[PDB]
């Protein structure tokens, strides 16, 4: 499928731009980018994607706001900027935590015009939290459910079963991998893709942390040759 660039929070916008050109060069049509809401990062992603001309790209914005009106405030500002910039596919990522908190926040993002909603599970999340989050998004009637987590075989099988149970045909799984150990990275990515294809996950994205240009190019090559 596609490849998502995850910005290392120690990465800069020049790091981001270089990761995008590398994927373009490798022949990746769907270049997805993932970061915590950042006005400057949104503007750079939009210009680079326009320069490359891959209007089949996606910006995924991570929000982590306690406050409910600060959330609406920021999600509105984010979506309107992305609208100015002609970003056709904008997704708002929400971490799970409180069940009621998750529902009101997803509702707010859906109201403001978020194209899809993404479930971002942090390492404090269980598979039971994931299932509940997915059921809440389905109940709300959101079009495309997206789930984003660190590579985990249980979470993959659970996610695949819940989507099949809800009938969520448009849903997407995005997996984040550790990168320091390149051998393990190759093994885990290989395994992830095989297992997701056995379970009929049709829309799966491999996410790569952007660190060093030399490192990123290695990982992206590996992921592409394996089938991402």
Author numbering: 1 to 228
Task: Give the authors' words.
Here, we report the de novo design of a TIM barrel with ovoid (twofold) symmetry, drawing inspiration from natural beta and TIM barrels with ovoid curvature. To this end, we report the computational design and experimental validation of a de novo ovoid TIMB protein, with a completely novel syntax and sequence. The designed protein exhibits an elongated β barrel architecture with loops which are not structurally involved and a more developed hydrophobic core. In accordance with our design goals, the protein folds solubly and is highly stable.
In order to assess whether the proteins fold as designed, and especially whether the ovoid β barrel curvature is maintained, we determined the 3D structure of the OT3 design by X-ray crystallography using molecular replacement with the design model. The experimental structure aligns with high accuracy to the design model, with an overall Cα RMSD of 1.59 Å. In particular, the β barrel showed excellent fidelity, exhibiting just 0.74 Å RMSD over α and β carbon atoms and mirroring closely the ovoid curvature specified in the computational design. Side chain packing in the hydrophobic regions also closely followed the designed rotamers. Especially, the close packing around A93 and A207 suggests that the placement of sterically small residues at the ovoid barrel minor face was a successful strategy. The redesigned β-α loops are free of any critical hydrogen bonding or structural interactions as in the original sTIM11, enabling their redesign and diversification. To assess the quality of the twofold symmetry design, we aligned the first repeat subunit to the second and found close agreement (0.74 Å Cα RMSD), indicating that the designed twofold symmetry is self-consistent and viable. Deviations between the design model and crystal structure can be largely explained by shifting of the helices and loops and may point to potential targets for future redesign. We noticed two main points of deviation: disagreement between the fourth and eighth helices (α4 and α8, which are symmetry mates) and the design model and disagreement between the seventh helix (α7) and the design model (these can be observed in Figure 2d). The total hydrophobic contacts and total buried area across all clusters are increased significantly in OT3 (174 contacts; 7864.8 Å2) compared to sTIM11 (81 contacts; 4067.8 Å2). However, visual inspection reveals that previous flaws with sTIM11 are eliminated in OT3, such as a cavity in the central β barrel and gaps between each of the hydrophobic clusters.
